[PDB]
């Protein structure tokens, strides 16, 4: 499926997915690695910049991560990558067909555990060597010894002993010999998550019932136990600041803090990550610092801090509840409709089924922000009609943006799914605009466009009506009536003279806009789903229902090129910056590259995940695709 | 941040360090008894004479102050400044003075404690260093002129920001502004950790322990709207009242009844929490006057909740414990009181527990019902249990006399429960 | 007295002076190689120096009606208002209503 024109750059807008992030320490600073599917990332912990992404995609999903100081140990399907600066410097292949569930590092050893209850040991070939490379031996656990492996932990000060926690009980393996030096007793609950403690000889345990069990290894007994109502514990961490604190992360989105000295909870966080996507998959107090880092599966990563106590003399009793600090955000859901913001390819609007539009940044990946949804108080004085429990806007299916008059009034018009109006957005202030645009014939908004001057806002109703609202005041100026079925695309030319529209009745109507006269009217065969105008050359392309792209000259009022070759519905398409190409993506899981002079495809890309939108840059450099599965935006580098 | 923010942070850490003479004549001049001109002209040697002479009078009132003359009020403890000593030694000076202000706070109307703490004010700088335990020990004397003096010295902590308009004011801090203190969620977490520290030494006095609850009632009162605010409030208040029932003192236990009954009427607690609270009221209930208050809790606690399982039988460990501390004759003398409180929803849970557990004394179970006019659903919910008991128990003539009370009143109610379960002729055939 | 004993943890003999960090473990300048039982003893005491022992691990362990019955049930619940009941009695001052 190797293309000749495009090649993937990276996927924009993803932070986490559910795999537990693992932190590493450089000197006194901290870096967070996460993963995104088949390609992991690295975040600083002091300002959450993006520092390193991996050089190649892995052949499958990364299942587990860990990081010792410079070297990030990534574990996809059968193999374990030992990565430095995102560069694969040594690939370590495990000799089974089983998939690796969990991973651990201590000393000279690496400890990888496949899913069929088997643990592989990899030794440093030399103590000078930094990454362990040589296969030492294969440790197994039969099911009479313990259950399925929950995790691998190595506790503090144990010479080659490996605390293997299972769903039933807890083991210990001296990896130099290979022998089970100690087995624990069987637990009444299914264990879900284990974590060590900054005290000696204690690992913490987490069950499917809400019970945290402190467990000693020198005594082999349960020292303390903490019951939690109605929660499946998914993450554990201890604050190492000098104040005893346990952080229990549920799978119902709750994060719960305890004070083991006072035997009390302190403050419980509610819904810091979505319950449905997995809740708090991993939470970790950074070492010796009052910073806990929470990363759920809903494509976010947040840091919470403890302020110092307000009490002078008391201190450890009056504890400030935790506090929101910096975070990074992505779409939890796949993106429905995107666009580019400006000419230098510096921002991308992306609206998804999460109902929250985002202005991602191709340039610097810490610059991406959710556009706010906080309604302007009306000019008129009567109050705004809406539910008092604020819910997000319905998901966005059509967006239009002309960048010519930015910072002075609105320049983004979005049409929400199944709403008789269609809102506006300011680009510079990152906010919903003050005007909302109605259709005045009770039809749903299926297509919007803006004038190049940025003064007129087109709205194509699903009952033919093309209302043209002005963009200072949101006032109504003109209402065009040619179509009878749903209008599915409007445009205005570069000169603000002529205007086109396309309906599901097949009519492609050509308007004058200076005068209000209908210039002409063209009828094609099939209904017409979408339109992309190209204002530099007055060519526009249609997507029909007979699975062909028809390109029509806007001046001479006739079909110039017709493109056959697709085999299912054409999702979206876009012209090149110079009008020399059309790249269309369809439900045949292909992405083709049409060539307008010679009238044929010159490159056919079979992607397994179907591509919903394809948008060129206004600059001649980047190509952005959004697929059906996955959350982020695939960016293609242009070899042309 | 800026420069002057960081450079005023050094000023707080050296608030007591006398550097210039003018710095000393501002710090030493403030005190409890002497005015600002006559305070600056006297030695520590002068103040120690008046303190150690006064402290021996307090040792006569109670012998507990005799120990502090060995350590804090001793003659060798004039040369020691706080600032010279290490960090471990200062926390012991705090833990002596924190142990001192517990014993001092009770005898605070008396003149000798005013001359006693002043040397511990002026030599040991407690009006700067530890003014939480200075103010929390003396937070109940807000109307008095001695607390008005205590305000006229202290740089107030960040938690006591409600009183900050009453520092060096004419009139005393009024009663509502004391509530605005306790309305904060953080200032309560001191006054828990002050009280659980104060109970462990078993020196909690009557006027103090009133003013605790008389604020803790009002905090529930000012937050009776915001159901979110109350939801985060009872890890603070009920954990006191749990530890306030563990006290040996009968006077501390009655304070737990005032907070429990007030919070239970303001927020419908769960069934398991009320049964939890009813055990701890039962468990440490020894003296006479604590028992009367304790019975009006369970009288009132069972009426606060309402739902499915409202009138459930009491658990086994609960009931015999309630029979242990409350007598079945003493509960009858309780119902014959002409106060006659609403005992309505509890006794129909009490009577059913008799019917299942004990069963030896159903003479009482008649005489319970003559004394209280019950509710409509309660009598049906009782009579279902006795008809279950009628089949199971080895049949007894006093059980027949119980139904004769219900043949007297609400005859159709006896029929409709029998027409729900069993036969009409079979019950009269059974007896 | 521990619950387990590793036999080959005594036989192992580690040189201290190789790595830059472990040279703080030695007691005198003359020693260079320490067996595994004393090495893991010394490595615990440095692990004391990095993380001091808190109060809850050592002194405290979990191992008529009681007095702590009110504290325990407060620990085992997180939401205190009886919303689970479906009471069929209407709560005052707060009316759950949804406009259609």
């Amino acid at each position: 499926k190797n293309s000749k024109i495009f090649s993937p750059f990276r996927i924009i807008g993803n932070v986490s997915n559910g795999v537990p992030f693992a932190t590493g320490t450089l000197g006194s600073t901290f870096y967070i690695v996460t993963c995104v599917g088949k390609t992991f990332q690295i975040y600083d912990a002091n300002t959450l910049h993006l520092l390193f992404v991996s050089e190649k995609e892995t052949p499958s999903s990364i299942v587990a991560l860990s990081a010792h100081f410079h070297y990030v140990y990534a574990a996809y399907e059968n193999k374990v990558g030992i990565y430095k600066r995102g560069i694969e410097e040594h690939l370590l292949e495990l000799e089974t067909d089983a998939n690796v569930e969990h991973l651990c590092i201590f000393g000279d050893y690496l400890c990888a555990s496949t899913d069929d209850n088997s643990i592989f040991i990899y030794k440093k070939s030399d103590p000078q060597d930094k990454y362990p490379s040589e296969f030492y031996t294969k440790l197994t656990v039969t099911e009479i010894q313990g259950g399925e492996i929950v995790s691998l932990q190595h506790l503090a000060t144990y010479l080659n002993k490996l605390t293997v926690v299972t769903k039933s009980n807890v083991l210990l393996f001296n990896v130099r010999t290979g022998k089970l030096v100690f087995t624990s007793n069987e637990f009444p609950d299914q264990i879900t998550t284990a974590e060590p403690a900054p005290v000696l000889d204690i690992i913490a345990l987490g069950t499917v019932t809400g019970e945290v069990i402190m467990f000693n290894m020198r005594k082999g007994k349960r020292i303390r136990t903490i019951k939690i109502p109605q929660s499946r514990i998914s993450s554990l961490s201890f604050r190492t600041d000098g104040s005893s604190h346990l952080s229990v992360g549920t799978s119902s989105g709750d994060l719960i803090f305890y004070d083991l000295d006072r035997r009390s909870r302190i403050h419980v966080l509610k819904n810091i990550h979505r319950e449905s996507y997995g809740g708090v998959t991993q939470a970790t107090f950074l070492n010796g610092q009052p910073i806990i880092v929470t990363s759920g599966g809903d494509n976010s990563l947040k840091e919470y801090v403890f302020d110092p106590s307000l009490s002078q003399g008391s201190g450890d009793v009056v504890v400030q509840p935790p506090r929101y600090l910096r975070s990074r955000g992505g779409h939890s859901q796949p993106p429905s409709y995107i666009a580019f913001a400006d000419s230098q390819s510096h921002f991308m609007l992306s609206a998804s089924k999460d109902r929250s539009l985002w202005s991602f940044s191709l340039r610097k990946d810490a610059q991406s922000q959710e556009m706010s949804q906080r309604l302007h108080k009306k000019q008129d004085g009567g109050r705004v009609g809406g539910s008092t429990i604020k819910s997000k806007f319905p998901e966005i299916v059509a967006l239009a943006i002309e960048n010519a008059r930015i910072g002075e009034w609105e320049n983004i018009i979005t049409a929400h799914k199944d709403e008789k109006f269609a809102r506006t957005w300011d680009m510079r202030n990152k906010r919903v605009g003050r005007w909302t645009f109605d259709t005045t014939d009770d039809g749903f908004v299926k297509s919007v466009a803006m004038s190049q001057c940025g003064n007129f806002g087109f709205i194509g109703s699903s009952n033919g009506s093309i209302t043209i609202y002005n963009m200072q005041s949101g006032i109504l100026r003109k209402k065009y009536k040619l179509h009878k079925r749903a209008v599915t695309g409007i445009s205005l030319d570069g000169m603000n003279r002529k205007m086109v529209s396309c309906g599901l009745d097949g009519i492609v109507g050509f308007y004058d806009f200076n005068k209000s006269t209908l210039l002409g009217k063209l009828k094609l065969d099939a209904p017409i789903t979408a339109m992309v105008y190209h204002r530099s050359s007055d060519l526009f392309a249609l997507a029909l229902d007979d699975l062909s792209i028809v390109v029509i000259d806007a001046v001479t009022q006739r079909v110039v090129r017709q493109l056959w070759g697709h085999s299912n519905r054409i999702t979206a398409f876009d012209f090149s910056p110079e009008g020399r190409w059309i790249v269309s993506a369809s439900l045949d899981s292909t992405i083709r590259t049409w060539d307008l002079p010679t009238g044929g495809c010159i490159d056919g890309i079979i992607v397994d995940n179907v591509a919903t939108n394809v948008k060129f840059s206004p600059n001649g450099d980047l190509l952005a695709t959004t697929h059906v599965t996955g959350n982020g935006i695939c960016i293609w580098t242009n070899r042309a | 941040s800026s420069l002057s923010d960081q450079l005023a942070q050094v000023a707080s850490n050296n608030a007591t360090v006398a550097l210039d003479r003018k710095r000393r004549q501002k710090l030493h001049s403030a005190s409890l008894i002497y005015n600002s001109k006559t305070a600056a002209t006297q030695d520590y040697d002068f103040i120690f004479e008046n303190a150690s002479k006064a402290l021996e009078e307090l040792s006569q009132i109670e012998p507990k102050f005799a120990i502090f003359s060995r350590t804090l009020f001793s003659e060798s403890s004039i040369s020691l400044d706080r600032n010279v000593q290490t960090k471990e030694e200062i926390k012991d000076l705090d833990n002596a003075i924190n142990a001192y202000l517990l014993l001092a706070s009770s005898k605070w109307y008396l003149a000798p404690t005013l001359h006693a703490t002043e040397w511990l004010v002026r030599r040991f700088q407690i009006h700067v260093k530890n003014t939480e335990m200075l103010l929390l020990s003396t937070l109940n004397y807000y109307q008095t002129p001695v607390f008005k003096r205590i305000l006229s010295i202290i740089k107030l902590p960040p938690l006591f920001n409600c009183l900050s308009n009453f520092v060096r004011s004419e009139k005393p801090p009024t009663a509502l502004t004391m509530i605005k203190l306790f309305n904060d969620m953080d200032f309560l977490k001191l006054y828990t950790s002050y009280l659980d520290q104060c109970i462990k030494h078993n020196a909690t006095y009557t006027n103090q322990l009133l003013f605790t609850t008389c604020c803790f009632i009002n905090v529930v009162a000012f937050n009776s709207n915001n159901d979110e605010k109350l939801n985060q409030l009872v890890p603070i208040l009920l954990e006191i009242s749990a530890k306030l029932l563990a006290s040996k003192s009968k006077d501390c236990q009655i304070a737990a009844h005032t907070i429990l009954v007030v919070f239970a009427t303001a927020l419908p607690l769960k069934k398991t929490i009320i049964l939890a609270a009813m055990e701890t009221i039962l468990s440490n209930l020894d003296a006479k006057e604590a028992k009367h208050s304790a019975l009006l809790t369970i009288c009132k606690l069972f009426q606060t909740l309402k739902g499915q399982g409202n009138v459930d039988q009491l658990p086994s460990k609960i009931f015999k414990l309630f029979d242990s501390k409350f007598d079945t004759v003493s509960i009858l003398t309780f119902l014959d009181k002409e106060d006659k409180p609403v005992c309505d929803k509890f006794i129909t849970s009490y009577t059913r527990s008799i019917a299942r557990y004990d069963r030896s004394k159903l003479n009482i179970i008649l005489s319970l019902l003559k004394k209280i006019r019950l509710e409509r659903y309660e009598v049906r919910l009782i009579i279902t249990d006795l008809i279950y008991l009628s089949e199971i128990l080895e049949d007894k003539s006093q059980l027949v006399e119980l139904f004769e009370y219900f043949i007297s009143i609400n005859e159709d109610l006896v029929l409709k429960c029998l027409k729900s379960l069993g036969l009409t002729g079979x019950x009269x055939x059974x007896x | 007295e521990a619950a387990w004993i590793d036999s080959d943890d005594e036989k192992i003999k580690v040189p201290i002076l190789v790595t830059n960090k472990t040279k703080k473990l030695r007691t005198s300048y003359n020693e260079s190689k320490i067996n595994g039982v004393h090495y893991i003893n010394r490595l615990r005491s440095q692990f004391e120096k990095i993380y001091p022992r808190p109060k809850w691990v050592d002194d405290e362990s979990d191992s008529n009606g009681d007095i702590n019955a009110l504290t325990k049930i407060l620990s085992t619940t997180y939401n205190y208002k009886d919303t689970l009941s479906n009471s069929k009695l209407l709560p005052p001052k707060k009316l759950d209503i949804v406009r259609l």
Binding site: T25, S28, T29, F30, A45, N46, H68, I105, F106, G107, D108, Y109, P127, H154, A156, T157, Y158, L159, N160, R176, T240, L286, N287, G288, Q289, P290, I291, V305, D307, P308, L310, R323, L325 | S1, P158, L159, N161, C162, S164, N165, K180, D184, D186, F187 | K11, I12, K13, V14, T19, K21, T22, G36, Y39, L43, Q46, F47, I50, Y51
Partner: peptide, 28 residues
């Protein structure tokens, strides 16, 4: 005035960890 709750600027102080990489000793 109520208790002035103001978040303070948080600097990461330095700390240290027990290295697990020293916990392995060679064969005898």
């Amino acid at each position: 005035p109520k208790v002035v709750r103001e978040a303070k600027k948080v600097e990461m102080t330095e700390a240290r960890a027990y290295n697990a990489d020293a916990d392995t000793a060679k064969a005898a």
